């Protein structure tokens, strides 16, 4: 559930693999569903930075711009149907998704800066 190392992240391009965006939506929708007082999913406006660290498993550290979606938590999250309005408050969130060598992923951390 963790890969712990100081330094050793390598920047990757957000243009080079569609999985970074998929993982960003996974992390954002999953995290926001767990938050108190929340009525709607948060969604991913942009993957701003991608960095990865690998030993056997891999950490994906994604720096995201996130905003409240138009989808209620009582509905099923859909990445291409739950977009944020331009006037919704945006914030920067950083998430580390840990995927073990055998392909199982979890959200090791998800932290948002204030708007």
Swiss-Prot record:
Q: Give the coiled coil ranges.
A: none
Per the database record, which ranges form the Cystatin domain?
11-100
UniProt-listed InterPro entries: Cystatin_dom, Cystatin_sf, Prot_inh_cystat_CS
The remark listed among the other comments is:
Decreases symptoms in mouse model of mannan-induced psoriasis-like inflammation by modulating immune responses. Vaccination of guinea pigs against the protein increases tick rejection during feeding, prolongs feeding times, reduces blood intake and induces visible inflammation at the bite site.
User: Region labeled Required for interaction with mouse ANXA2 — which residues?
Assistant: 70-114
Disulfide pairings: 71-82, 93-112
Q: How does it assemble?
A: Monomer. Interacts (via loop 2) with mouse ANXA2; the interaction results in reduced activation of mouse NLRC4 inflammasome formation upon Anaplasma phagocytophilum infection.
Keyword Disulfide bond listed? The answer is yes
Q: What is this protein called?
A: Salivary cystatin-L2
Q: Which organism is it from?
A: Ixodes scapularis
